[PDB]
Design a protein around this ligand. Sequence first.
Ligand SMILES: COC[C@H]1CC[C@@H]2/C1=C\[C@]1(C)C(=C(C(C)C)C[C@@H]1O)[C@@H](O)[C@H](O)[C@@H]2C
Ligand SMILES: COC[C@H]1CC[C@@H]2/C1=C\[C@]1(C)C(=C(C(C)C)C[C@@H]1O)[C@@H](O)[C@H](O)[C@@H]2C
Ligand SMILES: [Mg+2]
Ligand SMILES: [Mg+2]
Ligand SMILES: [Mg+2]
Ligand SMILES: [Mg+2]
Ligand SMILES: [Mg+2]
Ligand SMILES: [Mg+2]
Lengths: 235, 235, 6, 6
Amino acid sequence: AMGSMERASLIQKAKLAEQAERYEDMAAFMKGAVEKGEELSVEERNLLSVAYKNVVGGQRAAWRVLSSIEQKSNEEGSEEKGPEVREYREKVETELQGVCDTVLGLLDSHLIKEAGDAESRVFYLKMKGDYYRYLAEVATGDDKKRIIDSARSAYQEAMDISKKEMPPTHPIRLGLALNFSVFHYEIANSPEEAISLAKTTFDEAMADLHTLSEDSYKDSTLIMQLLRDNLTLWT
Amino acid sequence: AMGSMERASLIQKAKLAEQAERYEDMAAFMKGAVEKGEELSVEERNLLSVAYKNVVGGQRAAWRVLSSIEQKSNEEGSEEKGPEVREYREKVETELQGVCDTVLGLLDSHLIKEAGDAESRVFYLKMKGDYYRYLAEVATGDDKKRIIDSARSAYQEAMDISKKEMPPTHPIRLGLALNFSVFHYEIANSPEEAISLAKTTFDEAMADLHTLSEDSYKDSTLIMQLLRDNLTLWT
Amino acid sequence: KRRKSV
Amino acid sequence: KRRKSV
Ligand SMILES: COC[C@H]1CC[C@@H]2/C1=C\[C@]1(C)C(=C(C(C)C)C[C@@H]1O)[C@@H](O)[C@H](O)[C@@H]2C
Ligand SMILES: COC[C@H]1CC[C@@H]2/C1=C\[C@]1(C)C(=C(C(C)C)C[C@@H]1O)[C@@H](O)[C@H](O)[C@@H]2C
Ligand SMILES: [Mg+2]
Ligand SMILES: [Mg+2]
Ligand SMILES: [Mg+2]
Ligand SMILES: [Mg+2]
Ligand SMILES: [Mg+2]
Ligand SMILES: [Mg+2]
């Protein structure tokens, strides 16, 4: 598909698509780069995650709009407007599931299995938790518990490695904790675990800031502020 | 394609896609509605134009980003980075041309020919000028003059009808003049004509505001402020 | 900024 | 507003 383009050209075009805010193109260029079979560098893993996080973030936001319309349409006293809202929410839902399945597929074939370094392994397992969590946001049927547990299992293995192999200030460790905390709060119905995790993560990072350069400090404090934003919202 | 969906369902889904900011879907639903062969109401013509104006506005903005990168890459002292920028600008350019051609096709088959009322005929001819103008923004070859003249001819026939059949405050008349003035300023290398047209249009509308209700007043003064914004920028 | 169209 | 994720 992107099979005939050079890996380096795909990478270069992903960067151009990012500059152009063309995230669907960005994601397809990065998908092509992953399918070349070589491991991704730090920079390239970042492009991969930014492309999909934007594509799926757009589909999730639209799904939420449509879901909220569909819920109002189902309230007592609501005029029957036919199947259209549910159909079009399903259409957006299907496309979003397809994007999650695409990313999960890239992680399983074969990014995770070849990722030996903590910074690559934790990154990819965080993505695995994130995309199962997006599937969980829309899941309503037989598989919901297993989708939730898949998100949990991926975040958990990422947390276990990151606690062993990464400093408490590492941005990947902080972003993973941020998202796993959101998973607990809104997917797993465990707001206490979500709060505890955000708090402990924030405090352990505070105590390690002193080891950092000014640039590392700014990187870590950026995501710490997201932890604090959630603690503020939730407490 | 949208052939199996009811016209009213397409319309309803276009409105939902708008609420969800899913403008590609919106445009495809409206394309399906037009292809049902019945004339569009005022509301439906508005949905049609909003869907495409958003889709093409996104592609144009991305094309401008990529074009500016490509131009810097061609400046003296610029490192040769290979064909990627030009390729990916071409890719975005081709997709944008395809969208313009789709809309132009809907206008030619058969929206314009069945549009008898001034408000429908001027609207569709304004769209015809707009989409040839977007083609002109990217045109660099043998056909550029004819693409420009197609935009001109469509805007001109819309102006001639609108001056005959619509009050000077009508929002379609004001938006048509606004865009034809931009056509003159940046496509046709006629900034004096663009300024004259924006000024005359603004002043003729000012003098007709007194006939309007409060709601019509707000509709007309909104687009008049766009005319003034351009006059401010250009003078 | 950028000229207006509608 | 909306909780943060990254
Ligand atoms: C898989 O999870 C990736 C996610 C975990 C934390 C953060 C990640 C995404 C990107 C690439 C970055 C930022 C920072 C600007 C916050 C937002 C971006 O989306 C990087 O710069 C960070 O070093 C870091 C890897
Ligand atoms: C084909 O040119 C259509 C363009 C000409 C002027 C304006 C048009 C677009 C839309 C549908 C409208 C607005 C106003 C909010 C400014 C911006 C929208 O894009 C309508 O409400 C106006 O009555 C009017 C038809
Ligand atoms: Mg090669
Ligand atoms: Mg390896
Ligand atoms: Mg380490
Ligand atoms: Mg029917
Ligand atoms: Mg007719
Ligand atoms: Mg009239």
